[PDB]
Each structure stands twice: as structure tokens, then as C-alpha cells.
Amino acid sequence: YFKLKKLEKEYELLTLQEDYIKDEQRHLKRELKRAQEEV
Amino acid sequence: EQKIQETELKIRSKTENVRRLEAQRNALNDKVRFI
Amino acid sequence: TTAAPLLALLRENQDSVKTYALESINNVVDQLWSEISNELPDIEALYDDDTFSDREMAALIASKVYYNLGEYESAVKYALAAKDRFDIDEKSQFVETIVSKSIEMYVQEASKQYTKDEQFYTKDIIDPKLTSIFERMIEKCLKASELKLALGIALEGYRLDIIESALKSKLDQSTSENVKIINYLLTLAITTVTNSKFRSSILRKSFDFLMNMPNCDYLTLNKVVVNLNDAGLALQLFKKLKEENDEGLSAQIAFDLVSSASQQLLEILVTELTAQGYDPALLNILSGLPTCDYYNTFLLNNKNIDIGLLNKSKSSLDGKFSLFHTAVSVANGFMHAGTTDNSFIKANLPWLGKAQNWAKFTATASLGVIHKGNLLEGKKVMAPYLPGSRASSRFIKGGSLYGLGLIYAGFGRDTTDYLKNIIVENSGTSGDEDVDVLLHGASLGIGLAAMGSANIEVYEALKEVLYNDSATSGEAAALGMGLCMLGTGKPEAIHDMFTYSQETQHGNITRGLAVGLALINYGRQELADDLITKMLASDESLLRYGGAFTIALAYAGTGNNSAVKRLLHVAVSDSNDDVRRAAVIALGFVLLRDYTTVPRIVQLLSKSHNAHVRCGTAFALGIACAGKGLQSAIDVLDPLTKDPVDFVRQAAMIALSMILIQQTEKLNPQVADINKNFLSVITNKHQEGLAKFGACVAQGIMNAGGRNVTIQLENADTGTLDTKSVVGLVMFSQFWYWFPLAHFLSLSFTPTTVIGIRGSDQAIPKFQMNCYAKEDAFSYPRMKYSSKPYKVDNMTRILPQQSRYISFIKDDRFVPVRKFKGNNGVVVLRDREPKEPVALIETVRQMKD
16 A cells, blocks of 8 residues: 555655746846846 | 556656756756855 | 448438447447547437437447547446446456546545535435446445455545445454554545545544454544544543453553643543543543653663763853853753753752853753653742742743743643733733743743643733733743644634734734744644735735744645645745745645655755755754654755854754664764764864854754653654644744743653553563664664564663564563554553562652652
8 A cells, every 4th residue: 555655755846846946947037136246 | 546557647747847957956056156 | 330320320210220220339339439420419419318218228339439539528427328238347448447537526526515515425416427436336346355445535535435334344353454444544534535524524433343342453542532632432432441441451542642632632531531430540641640750760760861971061161151051951951851850950060150140041941851741849849949939030030930831731730820820910010121031931831831722811811911012021921822822722812913913013022923823823724824824915024934834833744735835935035034944944844744755855945045044944854854764864964064154053963963863873874973073063163153052952862861762743653743842843943043942842852662561550660572673772972684682672762763673572471462562652561460570660650649
């Protein structure tokens, strides 16, 4: 019965990493903003 | 038991999309160390 | 035979020929489905015709067409239209997919039709097309002797008839089949059934089959009365123990309930049980007298504090204000916790005198951690600092009222009226600063004793203190009210305490109310979303600091995909580092169920430009990974130690001490590097000031309780989320911002011991089980399955994580029951020969009794 439990535990990684992709893109926009300020 | 095995297909399908996240993370860490 | 022209001839006469025409179609349904696709509307149009009697054979034709076209929805309807030709017993991929498709659409309408009626599974409320396969599939799995697909689908389809009816026919009372069958119903239904009332009826059905008690599982019935918190089923279990008289069976039930029960259920097992009748032998057990003795007696037998390495830490300097005196006093209280050793205060004079007014709080509150578990002489420890005996100063006097909260927490009903009258006298006003310090420890003291229990008197008593807008005692007043509002709480107090936050703009007050608004909502899940929305919309730093922990407390236990997405956006969009730190710490409380994916999530957030983000993910990693496995979480904390930031190193050292408990002796390679850092960071001047302060505290966490107690949160011994353990970890997030709160961490330390005691009363003898385990027993800080027995397996440190390999020998005066039950906070195994030369040793338990 461990096959069913091991699968549901892997969706916890898939849950956060879907919205975490766009978080890096929004962070990249802040890094490019700070990059122009450092110059 | 094929209904549960079909749900497992999403894990291997989204795994390829997770690998795209690793591309932007290394590019982001280069910007963090730069600033 | 070809179905295309035959369905086009349906407009002619002689319907008898059409019967033989439909018979030849059943052969080509699996061959060519392309030519029949255009003639499909002729089949459905004749189904509603009352003069068309061939719908039985016509349903078989359309069932195998729409399915092959790629539409799984129509395959269910056209197959069951006749309710005859459909054969579920035939082995094919055509039926099995329709079964999985019908169940997929049945579980969706099960929760939607629950609002209209709860009997929908016994009635026609659901369209019978979705209930025909769902009923016949379970009956087919019952004949195949497979309970995995029968019980798993039943929990998803929201049908109580399957659990009740099928369990009677599967009875196997070898006496070991009915125990496991119900076990799958308790674990799966928590992560599957959304409705709290449907899963509540499931626990009530298992009580009837186990009511006769034919040497069945007594642990299953314990988890039923704790989750339901029903006074009817709780007191009914004790009534069965009166008919069948066993002193070893009734004890193991009583010691297990008092540990796993919430605050509201403990009052039912004591106050409510007395009114309806009780057992004089089982009444003192539920009152916590032998339970608190387990904390005092087990830890006192074997305790190694390693004074050699402890003296070098606290003898370095008398300075650094209260930051040094706290690190040495709180870490020392870890090793002596439960053993009632005052040697730090008594045997060592100088370390007490060097403390300032605010620094004497940790020296006094350390006794509350050391003497925790004393229901009799605990007041005598604070006797010189109690009110009416005065003190050397009123600043240290306030710490005595806080020490009573740590010792008596949850049992402090006797101290409820004692701590309340002190607040009422000072509730009017205050003319001095130290007067608020006296009420500061009183508010936190009355909050811990009444923690989990709703009390309107304490709430109204602390409400008047908030009106005075006190800078010191005003923060503890909100913390004392939040502990009484745990669980369901009072809905009116939600908006009242939230209104006072906007009206009164005080540093400590608003931050204290923010934590109080987090504690008032506990386990409410979506019911707390009204308060969460108000905090996320506000730009206040303190409202967003407590908004993360509000999600952590209500959404804990079973993980929620919505709570993860909420806490993720808070640590990104918001630029406040304290809120980003509080958001990543709140994520660990939702992930308590799965500890394997925690290191992978915190490692992604461990790379950023902010130090507070790395500081929060450090301690949040050690929360779930403390009492669990997966040693690789230490490698994630390795780059966090090299961080020049001071508070990142301190949170990393504390996180290392939580995961590395009992990881020595050829288990983890990182136990050698952490033992050197004990005296290395303190003596080194290159390190951070706060880095060496937490390294001394981390040194005492692994050796806490004499290298015995460990931090257990969401484990098999408790059975549910520990209320005392989850709150103590939230208070740790605030350390140097106000004054160290680490005293609240003592609630999460429980000892690990395995002993049989006797079959009647308390003994604690000395014996040897001689089983296979790694050697933690003789391992102390200095200056594969081999079936190999070990010297002393009794009590001490042992190895509770890998203990599943530890057996139990039947050659002694005891007898095996659960085959190493493994519960440390209960023990007291079955003794088949009481009052025998088991080499009994009388402990100090009579002092606390």
C-alpha cells in the first residue's frame, strides 16, 4: 500500500514549484532593476 | 489499479517542466552574487 | 454485418428483421467504428421510444463506439442504459476504464450532493448511472479478497454502507485481521475525506465491532475518542473496562489517552468522568500523577550532563549583558529538565549574581524547565519569589509566576485562581515598571496553565490590562488570551482583538495581538480565511508577521496545496525580511506530514540575497526533520553555517541540534563536526556574537534530559498535531528582537524509554531485553540487521527512530502483546507474573505523588 503514499508525497514538490517559476521571473525583474541602479 | 497509475503519469510529465526551473535558478543565483 | 447501412434501414418496416440485423452488429463493434459514427444519432433517438424493445442490445452497440472514439463520459451512460448486457466480471480493458471513469465522476458528485442530503449513497439522489458500477465494483473486489481497492475507493466516493456492510463478511477473529483492516480506515480518511462529519461516522462504526473487546486493539479505540472528543464514547470505553477486569489492559488505555488528548478532552476524563462514575485506580492516571512521574523518574535514572564541557562554556565571561546569561542558563535547563536539579542556581553562586534585572528572568524560568512535571512541590521551588515572601527585587519576582506556567501547563487548574488574583489586583493601573514585570510572568503563567481551555474569566481579566496600553505587561496579556482560545475558540474574540490592534499602535502590543490572533484560530483551515485576508491586505509589518503563523496553525497536519501557494507569495512580493522569514517558517508546519520533501523545498529558498530568508528556512528545516530520518538535511544546513550573518548561524546551530539527536555512533558523519563547534565558536573571536550564543544552546539540546528527551512533532505516539509542541516552536522565531523566548521550547521534549513496569502499579525495575539495536547507551560526549542482542535495552537513550528492528523477549516475567509497541510516553507492558523477583527499584515518584 506504500505505492499510493509515496506518490502523494511527491506532489508537494510539484505544488510549490509551479508558482515558484514565475517568482524567479518577478525576482529577475527586480534584479534587472537593481542592475541598472548599480551602474 | 490503472486509475492510480494514470495519476502517476502527471509526476513524470511535470518533472520535465521542473527541469526548466533549474535553468532559471542558476541564472538567478548569478544575478544574486552579482548584486 | 456492417453497422452503417443497417442503422440507415431503421426507417423501414418489419422490425423483426431489425433484431437479426443488430445481432450481426455486435461482432463489428470492435472492428470498424468509423462508419457507425455517422449513424450514432439513430441509436440514441430510439432509446426513448416506448415501441422500441431492442434498447437492451442497442445499448451494447453504442457502448463500444463512443468509447473507441475517445469519449470516456459516454461509455458509462450507453453501457448501463440496459442494466443487463453490461458484465463487470469479464476481464478486458474496455470495462476497467469505464469503471475508473464512472468512479472519477462519482467522487465529484459525492461531495456536491452531500449538502442536500447525507443519505445520498442509500438513495436515488445521485443518478443511478454513476452508482451502478460503483456498487458492483466494490462487490467484485470483495469476492477477490482485495481490501486495498475496496476501502480506498469507498473513502473517495463518500459511502458509509461499504465500510459497515463489507466489514462484517470479512471478519477473521487468528485475532489479527480486524485490527489492520480498521487501521487503513483511520489513516487514509484523514488525507482523503474532506467532510468532517462523514469521517466522524466512520470512527463511530468501528467502536461497535470493538465494543465487546475480544482481545482486540485498544489503540484504535483511543484514536476514535481523541479525534471525535465525544464524552459519550470516551466514558463508554471505561465502562467496558469495569465489566472485564484487567489491570494491565485498563492501564495501557488510560496512560495513552492522557498523553494524546487535547485540553478539552482532559477535562472530560477528569471532571466529567467523576460525575458519571470512575475507577479509583484509573482516576489518578488521567489526572497526570503517574504521567508527570514518567518525566521525572525516567530522566533521573540515567542523566549525563558532561559538566567538563559545560563549565568551559559558562566560565568564559561574565559580560555580554543578558545574551550570554540566557545561553548558559537555558541550555543548562535542557539537560536537567524533569530531573529537578537546582545546581545551576544553588550549587553555582557567581552565575546568578552577574545577571541584570531582565537577565534574572532566564535564571528563574530555567527552574520551570528543570522542575517541569512537579504537581506538588513545584510551588516550593519558587517559594522565596512567590508573592507575600517578596524577593531581592520585583524584576526577578515576575519570573517566578512564569516558571509555574511551564511546570503546571495543562494541569494548572489548581494554579488558575492563584495566578488570576495577582492579575486582577494590578489590572487597575501600574505606577512602576517592575510591577508590569510581575504581571508579565503572571499573564504568561496563567496562559500556559489554561492553555487549550476556554476561560472567560482569564480573558476578561487580561482584557482590562490591554486597555491600559502597557508596553511590557501589555504584550503578555495578548499571549495569555491566545492560549485559552486555542482550537475552536471564541468567534467574537476574533474581531475584538483585531480591532484593538488598529486602535492601539504599540510595538509590543500590536505584535502581541498579532500572535494572539494566530493562536485563536487553530485547526480551522478555511474558517480562518477571513482573518488572513485582513492581514495580507494590510501593509503593517506586525500584521504580516503573524499572518504567516496563522496559516501554519490552521493548515497544519494534512498538507494543503492552497496554503503552500499563499505562504510562497508572501516571502516573494513582500520586501520585509522579518515577514519573509516568518513565511518560510510557517511552511514547515504544513509540511509536518511529509519530511522527505522539506529539504528540497528549503534548499530552493536557501539561495537569495536576504539573510532572514536563509535564517527562516534553516529552523523550518529542523522542525519536521528533528524526530524523523533523512540525515541529508544537515548538508543543506552546511552552507548556512558559513554565512557571516549572525542570526543565520544561530538558527542553523539550533536546527542542527534538532536533527542530529541520537545520530551519533556511525550513523551520520556530521556528528563529529558539530561536537567540535561547541567550544570552537565560543572561544573564537572571529565568529559572530550571536553565533556562539546559539552554539551553547545547541550543545544542550542534544544532551537535554541527559541525552534522552527528543523533539517529537506529528509522530505515532501522539497520533495528531501536538498543541504544546507547535506553539513552543512559534515562540522561538522571536529571540533577540525583544528578549529570548526559548523557555517555551520545553513543551516539545519527551523522553524515549521502553519498560514493562508491572501489571498493577508503578515499579520501574531493572532488566535486559537483549535485542538488536545500534549502541546509543554508552555513547556520551567525551573530553543491516544482524539479529544480535544487546547488553541493556531498558530505558536510557536506545534508538527510537530505527527501533522497529527491536523485538521483545518472552523469556522474562513479562509477555509480548504488540511486538514492541514502541510508545515511550505510555509503556507499562503486560506483566503475566506480578510481584515476582524482577529486581524492583523504588524511584522518587512518591515525592511528586
